[PDB]
TrEMBL record, chain B:
Residues at the site labelled Avian adaptation: E14
Function: Plays an essential role in transcription initiation and cap-stealing mechanism, in which cellular capped pre-mRNAs are used to generate primers for viral transcription. Recognizes and binds the 7-methylguanosine-containing cap of the target pre-RNA which is subsequently cleaved after 10-13 nucleotides by the viral protein PA. Plays a role in the initiation of the viral genome replication and modulates the activity of the ribonucleoprotein (RNP) complex.
UniProt gene name: PB2
Coiled coil: none
Family that this chain belongs to: Belongs to the influenza viruses PB2 family.
Cellular location(s): Host mitochondrion; Virion; Host nucleus
Domain of life: Viruses
Quaternary structure, from the entry: Influenza RNA polymerase is composed of three subunits: PB1, PB2 and PA. Interacts (via N-terminus) with PB1 (via C-terminus). Interacts with nucleoprotein NP (via N-terminus).
Name assigned to this protein: Polymerase basic protein 2
Species name: Influenza A virus (A/Zhejiang/DTID-ZJU01/2013(H7N9))
TrEMBL record, chain C:
Residue ranges with Polar residues bias: 55-64
Native source organism of the sequence: Influenza A virus (A/chicken/Shanghai/S1053/2013(H7N9))
Similarity field: Belongs to the influenza viruses polymerase PB1 family.
Binding-site list for Mg(2+) 3: D412, E457
UniProt-listed Enzyme Commission number(s): 2.7.7.48
Name under which the protein is recorded: RNA-directed RNA polymerase catalytic subunit
Record has Metal-binding as a keyword: yes
Record's subunit section: Influenza RNA polymerase is composed of three subunits: PB1, PB2 and PA. Interacts (via N-terminus) with PA (via C-terminus). Interacts (via C-terminus) with PB2 (via N-terminus); this interaction is essential for transcription initiation.
Pfam families, sorted: Flu_PB1
Automatic annotation (TrEMBL), chain D:
Family, similarity comment: Belongs to the influenza viruses PA family.
Post-translational note: Phosphorylated on serines and threonines by host kinases, including human casein kinase II.
Highest rank taxon of the organism: Viruses
Its job: Plays an essential role in viral RNA transcription and replication by forming the heterotrimeric polymerase complex together with PB1 and PB2 subunits. The complex transcribes viral mRNAs by using a unique mechanism called cap-snatching. It consists in the hijacking and cleavage of host capped pre-mRNAs. These short capped RNAs are then used as primers for viral mRNAs. The PB2 subunit is responsible for the binding of the 5' cap of cellular pre-mRNAs which are subsequently cleaved after 10-13 nucleotides by the PA subunit that carries the endonuclease activity.
Organism: Influenza A virus (A/Zhejiang/DTID-ZJU01/2013(H7N9))
Gene name of the record: PA
Subcellular location: Host cytoplasm; Host nucleus
Whole-protein residues included: 411 to 461 of 716
Name of this protein: Polymerase acidic protein
Quaternary organization: Influenza RNA polymerase is composed of three subunits: PB1, PB2 and PA. Interacts (via C-terminus) with PB1 (via N-terminus).
Amino acid sequence: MEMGRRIHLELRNRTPSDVKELVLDNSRSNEGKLEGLTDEFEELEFLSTINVGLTSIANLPKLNKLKKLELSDNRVSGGLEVLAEKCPNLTHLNLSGNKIKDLSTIEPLKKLENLKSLDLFNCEVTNLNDYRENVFKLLPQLTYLDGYDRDDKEAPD
Amino acid sequence: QIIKLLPFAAAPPEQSRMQFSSLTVNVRGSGMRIVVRGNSPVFNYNKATKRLTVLGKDAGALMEDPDEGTAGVESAVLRGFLILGKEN
Amino acid sequence: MDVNPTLLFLKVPVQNAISTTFPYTGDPPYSHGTGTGYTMDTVNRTHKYSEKGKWTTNTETGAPQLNPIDGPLPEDNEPSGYAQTDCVLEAMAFLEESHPGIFENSCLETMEIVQQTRVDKLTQGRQTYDWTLNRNQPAATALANTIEVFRSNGLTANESGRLIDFLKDVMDSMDKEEMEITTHKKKQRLNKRSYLIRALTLNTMAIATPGMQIRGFVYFVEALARSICEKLEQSGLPVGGNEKKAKLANVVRKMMTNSQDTELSFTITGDNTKWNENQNPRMFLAMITYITRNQPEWFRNVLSIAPIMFSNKMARLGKGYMFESKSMKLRTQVPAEMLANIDLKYFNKSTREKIEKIRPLLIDGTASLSPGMMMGMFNMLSTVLGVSILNLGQKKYTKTTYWWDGLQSSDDFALIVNAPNHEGIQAGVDRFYRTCKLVGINMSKKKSYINRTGTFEFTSFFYRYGFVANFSMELPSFGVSGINESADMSVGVTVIKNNMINNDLGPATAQMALQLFIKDYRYTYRCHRGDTQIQTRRAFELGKLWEQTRSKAGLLVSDGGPNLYNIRNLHIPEVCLKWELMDEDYQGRLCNPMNPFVSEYDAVATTHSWIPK
Amino acid sequence: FNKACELTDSSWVELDEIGEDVAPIEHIASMRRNYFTAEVSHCRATEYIMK
């Protein structure tokens, strides 16, 4: 399947303004860029893109109600200022399995002051020594890293 | 419980989620453990004779104050929880 | 961002963090360096460095011999075993001149111990080659077997109990045409050549262990060498830690402070790796004969037997080899006795080349190695030679503007050379290099460095601006020696105390050693503190004791009492440390002489001291 | 190595007690030992050691 067909199927013959959760699993994107999503989406609250073949999140619209964004099992790498400004209200984020070099590229996520949980897994950044504490220092607003807090306690919903 | 647990509060506390089942005191290098609930080798209390023993050395005698719950519930053992006595 | 401990040195001078570079601080679990190919390479290199030495055929062992002494002087920097007898004798004479009488006093103070030592002195030592059984054996059983065999063969003078008497017995037995060995009844007749080749064996599991006929002479020569070294200042043996630490500081102070400001001083640290290749038993015999000039002839013979015997030493060749066929999934082992005549297709290029090189030496499954030495038998004599070379560096002998001094301990050496200019330093170092080459002392140019005076190392005693960093010892075992409660406690506490005293063990490290000691002792003997919640059968009765006693600190640690040991109080016995605190009834019960259990270390004769079944 | 050098969240090593310290050098030794132990008792290296 392709992006646009998947989005249309998820919409369920409804306007793109009454969706509170969008599931785009095992989809595909051309040129590794986001397609289909537009400004009309303004009620989305729980997004999910897995194995979508996106090179970078460079065409994400302004989902001001986007709170639980997930970009997992993908190869997203590059600047994250687009996520910082387009969706400044992110609360839960997931980048597990992504391609990220070091903290110099994850710094822009500090702009979002509502990020209560940031998840990283099987990445290059996690290889660095004292990765957990260094990220916590870089993101004080964060409270649960990799589903664990600063004192290694599981994070109940 | 008040006498057992009071001295640990001297530091400038910070928020935490851990639920400490025992606190560690460093004595002669080796670290002894005092349990928040019940008796511990560091802190023993014999209610039959009403005597407090600290590491085997007597520390004084306790007299119950004008406040007490003698029918179960103990609210100063589990953080955020109230213990209601025997199991069901 | 990524850990990198080496970067610590970017601000901390290396000498401070030298312990960072000692990976093991213990005995590794692989034991790499023993076998057969290593012996092959050792023999090949020993005979290669003597390439131009004269070849001859022995008359008694019937094996070839190589004599490189007085050979052509080396022309290249490669190692040379061409040690000149005249130069060695001149160096020894100069050493005597600078230290008059030294050899005389050594000889006259050692004659008594030569005439006093008993036979049992040979029991102490390392593993020994048992000619009776042809395998490394404990020294005591080897001695018992040797006396039994000699008694069977009618050589019972050693019964007097004197070491010299046993050496004469060994001489007589070696003079006999053939002898009998009775093993249990199997009788083996060893002819003169067979017995001679056996007695001059050097087993290889001190890598090499000689036989028993050569123990006493080696002991006597080493005793003389030690006595000579004692009077010598530059000698690095047999002093301990504090004196060794002071030696470096004293040498540096002598070399630097006295020197003028204009004069420039430098120090070279060098390692004499593979130190036994270029030293021959014949040169040792020459120096021994020089040492005992104008002395009783019997003493000279006793002292010169050792290098004479070693010059005809026979080297055994490992246990053998192991072959495996992957095609048929088979494994087999071949002994060294069949290595003389066997195909070379099995082995690889290097191994077959080594076999080709060493083929013409294997006599009765034992190579013949006249030149070169083996590790850890004549170390003190090597130190004597080194200190002689150093003494040849005084301003009077050098007859030059520069001069030098230093220290040598036969495994490492340090040399301070000072001169009015850089060219003077170069000339001094070059002259020392050549002079030490002439005698056969080899300085490895790939493991030596030169730097301004003040910083260097010697036998791992790293020295920086008056500070020594001794790292010449490993941490011993802080565990249960397995005799009894009091015995184990006493021996181990004494061990930690002694390591603290001399081996330069930090106080905090000693405290953790004592902590782990207490842990292991309680775990092994199941004597845990009464307050602890651990559970075991012995904890039942032990618990009762904890309730009965009126003084917890009085109880012995083995009885469940607290451990009151610390840095301040380590030498005191455990029983004596708790004598007064022990309750009177407990004291009476513990030390009852009428107990049914009882019919070095410092400890009391309590009931906790029993003999395990 | 990086992960072996990180800080764990458990007491991997338990050590027994010793006598009191009276000499000032004993005080220095106890201080050094306690500081180092508190530092490393929560490191993964101790976990590997015990395992």
